[PDB]
């Protein structure tokens, strides 16, 4: 999701980097090794990824 | 049910995330697979669900 820009060192969430790097709006973004997400600091990140 | 919010990562139990999502106050919550609620851990979440 990126940080608010209020926190020290805040940077845009991971997707924005690729949206810059590919210089396009239709990358073939690829999730990798999905079997083992869960049990995050907020329960799980995965919900927002849904 | 969530946590006390004096903890670092506290988030409300799943229902309130739903209510934040579903704009209506009376949506069609759909829990599924009550049959295999995890209950080996000391303290049974079933009680909370009751």
Curated annotation (Swiss-Prot), chains A, B:
Q: Where in the cell is it found?
A: Mitochondrion matrix
Tissue localization of expression:
Duodenum, heart, lung and liver, but not thymus.
The record's comment about this protein's domains reads: The Lon N-terminal domains are crucial for the overall structure of the protein, maintaining it in a conformation allowing its proper functioning.
Function of the protein:
ATP-dependent serine protease that mediates the selective degradation of misfolded, unassembled or oxidatively damaged polypeptides as well as certain short-lived regulatory proteins in the mitochondrial matrix. Endogenous substrates include mitochondrial steroidogenic acute regulatory (StAR) protein, DELE1, helicase Twinkle (TWNK) and the large ribosomal subunit protein MRPL32/bL32m. MRPL32/bL32m is protected from degradation by LONP1 when it is bound to a nucleic acid (RNA), but TWNK is not. May also have a chaperone function in the assembly of inner membrane protein complexes.
Disorder this protein is connected to according to its UniProt record:
CODAS syndrome: A rare syndrome characterized by the combination of cerebral, ocular, dental, auricular, and skeletal features. These include developmental delay, craniofacial anomalies, cataracts, ptosis, median nasal groove, delayed tooth eruption, hearing loss, short stature, delayed epiphyseal ossification, metaphyseal hip dysplasia, and vertebral coronal clefts.
Q: Per the similarity annotation, which family is this?
A: Belongs to the peptidase S16 family.
UniProt subunit comment = Homohexamer. Organized in a ring with a central cavity. The ATP-binding and proteolytic domains (AP-domain) form a hexameric chamber, while the N-terminal domain is arranged as a trimer of dimers. DNA and RNA binding is stimulated by substrate and inhibited by ATP binding. Interacts with TWNK and mitochondrial DNA polymerase subunit POLG.
Name of the protein described by the UniProt record: Lon protease homolog, mitochondrial
Origin species, per record, is Homo sapiens
Query: Which region of the full protein is contained in this chain?
Result: 559 to 608 of 959
